[PDB]
């Protein structure tokens, strides 16, 4: 996350971190329930075998509230391709159930029509992750969050050198130096409504980070609610 602020105690409980064999986070995720994590399909290439850590806010040491969960089943959308980055979504079923506590809680999945009419029409959303804090740099050891304005669909299509499909939406700033960055992929994009946070997107991609005239691209969760539901069953 470029810019933004540190996620303070209990502010981003639905954040999940995918860790490789070296116990280093390479992508984020969103806790949906005790057994399921939502993330980006393109992350399932960043590492072969991986696990999921929840309740972490500081990568340096171990507070005692963190918990590691092995993945039982990986469900990646069969239509994802690096050529288009379309259908950038995946669901993970964990071997053991997550125990909710301070800094560990699921984000709500909204209904399609309501989310589109009421959530995605709000002024802003929140993105978070342990990603880079500058285009060139190491991953952040601290979990960060950033309020990102929803961006007009026509405006973002124009500003993009890549096709923005109906499974994607844009959020961020035109010139203000704040945006998601490498490593934040798969992380949550949530929208607050009456103090309740609903997952509305998955950190997907962007042409550079916080680049002037460029916005952040996110997978539109509302376009895959039925796909997600089917995944949390099989």
């Amino acid at each position: 996350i470029v810019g933004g602020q540190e996620c303070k105690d209990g502010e981003c409980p639905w954040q999940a971190l995918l860790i490789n064999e070296e116990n280093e986070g390479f992508c984020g995720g969103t806790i949906l329930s005790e057994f399921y994590i939502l993330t980006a399909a393109h992350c399932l290439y960043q590492a072969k075998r991986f696990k999921v850590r929840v309740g972490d806010r500081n990568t340096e040491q171990e507070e005692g509230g963190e918990a590691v969960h092995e993945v039982e089943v990986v469900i990646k959308h069969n239509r994802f391709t690096k050529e288009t980055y379309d259908f950038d979504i995946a669901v993970l079923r964990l071997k053991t159930p997550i125990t909710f506590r301070m800094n560990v809680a699921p984000a709500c999945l909204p209904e399609r029509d309501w989310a589109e009419s009421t959530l995605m029409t709000q002024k802003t959303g929140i993105v978070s992750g342990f990603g880079r804090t500058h285009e060139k740099g190491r991953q952040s050891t601290r979990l960060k969050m950033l309020e990102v304005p929803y961006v007009d669909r026509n405006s973002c299509k124009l500003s993009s050198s890549f096709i923005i499909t109906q499974n994607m939406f844009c959020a961020g700033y035109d010139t203000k130096q704040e945006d998601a960055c490498q490593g934040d992929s798969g992380g949550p994009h949530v929208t607050r409504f009456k103090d309740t946070y609903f997952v509305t997107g998955i950190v997907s991609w962007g042409e550079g980070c916080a680049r002037k005239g460029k916005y952040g691209i996110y997978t539109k969760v509302t376009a895959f609610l039925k796909w997600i539901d089917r995944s949390m069953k099989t």
Partner: protein
Amino acid sequence: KLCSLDNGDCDQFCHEEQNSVVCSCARGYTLADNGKACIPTGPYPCGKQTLE
């Protein structure tokens, strides 16, 4: 405006049935007696920051 007028006074989901507002909640929540508020069923309902 029904659902378009302040989300029909619903805490969460708002639908229009028979040209009337009908509120509903995410899993883990129960619709309150007033048919508008959503009451959590456990200590860690979805979408709530853990600030306590």
